[PDB]
Structure 1
Amino acid sequence: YQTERFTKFSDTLKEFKIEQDPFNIIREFRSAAGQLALDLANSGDESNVISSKDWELEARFWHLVELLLVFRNADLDLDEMELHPYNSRGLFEKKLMQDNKQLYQIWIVMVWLKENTYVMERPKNVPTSKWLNSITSGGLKSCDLDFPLRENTNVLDVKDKEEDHIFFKYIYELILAGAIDEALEEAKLSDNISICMILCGIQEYLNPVIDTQIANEFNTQQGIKKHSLWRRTVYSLSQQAGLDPYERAIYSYLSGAIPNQEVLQYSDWESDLHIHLNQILQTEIENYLLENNQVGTDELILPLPSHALTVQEVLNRVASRHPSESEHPIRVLMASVILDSLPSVIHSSVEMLLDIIDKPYLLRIVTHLAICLDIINPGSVEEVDKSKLITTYISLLKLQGLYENIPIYATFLNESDCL
């Protein structure tokens, strides 16, 4: 049956033109692609695993589109936040994310990135308690994480290191996926209290009593006041070798830094891009705080880089670092959406019809995207480009023998007359 696909997308358009909000179209496009992603994936010829991934990718694209256009377009402007110098850093961070839409967009994108991150299954047969092997062998004179750092790592049993590896890797995957609550649960429950505690430093300080404008979200002070310190402390910890590469990786991510080579070598376009947007973000916040004298000089223990990249440049670098992946045609759209250069790319792939015909999803996707765009933002895509796109896709509806559902797509030109 699967050669139904176009129906689903077409179907969604029917429902829209007929209850005469348009963001639902895309939401459905997403779900549609996802549903199809499942079909080709389950039981299939290994020629299908490929086009299955091109559907999952499809789906992620629709999601990213929804998220960003919702934020950008459903922008109806709220009330400005008036801080005082007595206010906590927490509030200033919030203010920053409110006022600077460019940067919040980075947040949105990171959220999307996390959403679609793979995490291993929870490690089984985890041991009763930490470093149990070393303790049992005798030779841990101190039971604290820093003991084998104070003096040769030869202290820790091999099996203990192997388990610490399992743990820190799992925690790392969870952190990259946004699963911070799960990471704290794992830390707690796996007898890694001190690491847990480390994960608690992630929050900026708020006090509901002082920072009135969040006395709703909070009933109790929380987060840590000397955060610039925390951050250097963690970063330095991240640079100290004789720690497991995933642990160092974790601290890197937390300090707004770029994890060690041993770990980073396995990160893909999404993972890598995520890492570097995290860096942009971290740097930008800490700079925002410095420009408002909410950082205390004592805390500038160490040099961290102060110069934030632009999303443009991060993308360019990550691209050159992952050319194959970068060049994949829906991930180009992903980037195009991220930079807003989107009608830009529409008109572009339009002129590539004048090695876009070779891949099937593309001509469809661009067309339905163009439709959505001009629905949500009348004017968005050049009238001509709509004409050209629908023209060509329609002729494929004909080549597929689905003339049945051509009128729906017609509802965008007087050129429709000619059908």
Structure 2
Amino acid sequence: YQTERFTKFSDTLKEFKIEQDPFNIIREFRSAAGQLALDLANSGDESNVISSKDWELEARFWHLVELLLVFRNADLDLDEMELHPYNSRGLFEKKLMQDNKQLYQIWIVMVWLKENTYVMERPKNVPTSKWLSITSGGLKSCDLDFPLRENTNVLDVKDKEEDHIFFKYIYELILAGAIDEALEEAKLSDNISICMILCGIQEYLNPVIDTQIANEFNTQQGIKKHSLWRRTVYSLSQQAGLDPYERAIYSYLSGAIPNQEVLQYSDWESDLHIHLNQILQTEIENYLLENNQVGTDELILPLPSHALTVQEVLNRVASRHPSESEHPIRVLMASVILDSLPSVIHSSVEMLLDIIDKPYLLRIVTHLAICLDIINPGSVEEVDKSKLITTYISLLKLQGLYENIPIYATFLNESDCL
């Protein structure tokens, strides 16, 4: 049956033109692609695993589109936040994310990135308790820093192997946004001190002082000397004789770029995520410095102060992952991220004048163009709509689905000619 696909997308358009909000179209496009992603994936010829991934990718694209256009377009402007110098850093961070839409967009994108991150299954047969080295005798101190104070030869091999299992799992969870799960794992796996480390992630708020969040909070929380925390963690991240995943974790937390042993396995998404995290971290800490909410004592160490632009991060990550970068829906992903989107529409339009070779593309661009001009009348050049629908329609003909051509017609007087 699967050669139903176009129906689903077409179907969604029917429902929209007929209850005369348009963001639902895309939401459905997403779900549609995802549903199809499942079909080709389950039981299939190993020629299908490929086009299955191109559907999952499809789906992620629709999601990213929804998220960003929702934020950008459903922008109806709220009330400005008035801080005082007595206010906590927590509030200033919030203010920053409110006022600077460019940067919040980075947040949105990171959220999307996390959403679609793979995490291993929870490690089984985890041991009763930590470094259980203790049994061999030779841990004179039971604290994480003991084998750092003096040769790592202290820790049993099996203990290191388990610490590896743990820190890797925690790392995957952190990259996926699963911070609560990471704290649960830390707690329950007898890694209290690491847990505690994960608690430093929050900026300080006090509901009593920072009135404008006396709703979200009933109790002070987060840590006041955060610039310190951050250097402390970063330095910890640079100290070798720690497991590469642990160092990786601290790198991510300090707004830094994890060690080579770990980073070598990160893909376009993972890598891009890492570097947006860096942009973000740097930008916040700079925002705080420009408002004298950082205390000089805490500038223990040099961290880089110069934030990249999303443009440049993308360019670098691209050159670091050319194969992946060049994949045609991931180009759209980037195009959406930079807003250069009608830009790319008109572009792939002129590539019809090695876009015909891949099937999803011509469809996707067309439905995207439709969505765009629905949500933002004017968005895509009238001509480009004409050209796109023209060509896709002729494929509806080549597929023998003339049945559902009128729906796509509802965008030109050129429709007359059908």
Whether the TM-score (by the shorter chain) exceeds 0.5 is yes
Cα distance per residue 1:266-312 (max 9 Å; x no partner): 00000000000000000000000000000000000000000000000
Deviation per residue, 1:69-115 (Å, 9 max, x gap): 00000000000000000000000000000000000000000000000
Q: Which residue is equivalent to 2:28?
A: 28
- Taking the aligned partners of 1:316 and 1:127, their CA distance within structure 2 comes to 44
Alpha-carbon distance between aligned partners in 1 of 2:180 and 2:52, rounded to the nearest angstrom = 31
Q: Determine the C-alpha separation between the residues in 2 that align with 1:369 and 1:222.
A: 43
CA drift of 1:208 comes to: 0.0
2: distance between equivalents of 1:75 and 1:238?
A: 39
Deviations 1:301-358 (A, max 9, x none): 0000000000000000000000000000000000000000000000000000000000
- TM-score, normalised to structure 1, is 1.00
Q: Which residue of 2 aligns with 1:279?
A: 278
Secondary structure of 2:158 counterpart = helix
| Alpha-carbon distance in 2 for matches of 1:201, 1:143 | 22
Listed one character per residue, the Cα deviations across residues 175-224 of structure 1 (whole Å, up to 9, x for unaligned) are 00000000000000000000000000000000000000000000000000
User: How do 1:170-209 residues align onto structure 2 when only pairs under 5 Å count?
Assistant: 170-209=169-208
Structure 1 residue 14 displacement after superposition: 0.0
- Computed over aligned residues only, the root mean square deviation of the Cα atoms, in angstroms, reads 0.0
Deviation (angstroms), 1:137: 0.0
1:234 Cα shift?
Answer: 0.0
**Cα deviation 1:145-202 (Å, max 9, x = unaligned):** 0000000000000000000000000000000000000000000000000000000000
Q: Could you say which residue in structure 1 is the equivalent of 2:379?
A: 380
- Distance in 2, matches of 1:138 and 1:94, equals 49
TM-score (norm 2): 1.00
Q: Deviations over 1:115-156 (max 9, x none)?
A: 000000000000000000x00000000000000000000000
- Alpha-carbon distance between aligned partners in 1 of 2:310 and 2:370, rounded to the nearest angstrom: 27
Give a deviation string over 1:26-62, Cα, whole Å, max 9, x none: 0000000000000000000000000000000000000
Q: Does 1:393 align with 2:371?
A: no
* Partner Cα distance (1:71, 1:227) in 2: 29
CA distance in 1, matches of 2:334, 2:374: 22
Counterpart-to-counterpart distance in 2, 1:202 and 1:221: 15
The 3-state SS of whatever aligns with 1:137 is: coil
CA distance in 2, matches of 1:164, 1:141: 19
**Partner Cα distance (2:116, 2:88) in 1:** 33
SS of structure 1 residue aligned to 2:377: coil
Question: Which whole-Å CA distance do the structure 2 matches of 1:263 and 1:382 have between them?
Answer: 45
Cα distance per residue 1:342-390 (max 9 Å; x no partner): 0000000000000000000000000000000000000000000000000
Show CA shifts across 1:231-255 (max 9, x none): 0000000000000000000000000
CA distance in structure 2 between the aligned counterparts of 1:256 and 1:173, rounded to whole angstroms: 16
- Paired residue for 1:114? 114
Q: Distance in 2 between matches of 1:89 and 1:221?
A: 12
For 2:227 and 2:2, the matched residues in 1 are separated by: 55
- Mapped partners of 1:174, 1:128: distance in 2: 21
The percent identity for this pair of structures is 100
Q: 1: CA distance between counterparts of 2:199 and 2:399?
A: 56
**Alpha-carbon distance in structure 1 between the residues aligned to 2:32 and 2:351:** 26
Structure 1, gaps ≥5 residues long:
none
Q: By how many angstroms is 1:264 displaced?
A: 0.0
Q: Which residue of 2 aligns with 1:226?
A: 225
**Which residue of the partner structure matches residue 80 of structure 1?**
80
C-alpha distance in 2 between matches for 1:196 and 1:390: 54
Q: Partner of 1:10 in structure 2? A: 10
CA distance in 2, matches of 1:213, 1:65: 31
Aligned residues: 418
Secondary structure of 1:136 counterpart: coil
Tell me the secondary structure at the aligned position of residue 167 of structure 1.
helix
Alpha-carbon distance in structure 1 between the residues aligned to 2:253 and 2:243: 16
SS at match of 1:293: coil
SS at 1:331 equivalent: helix
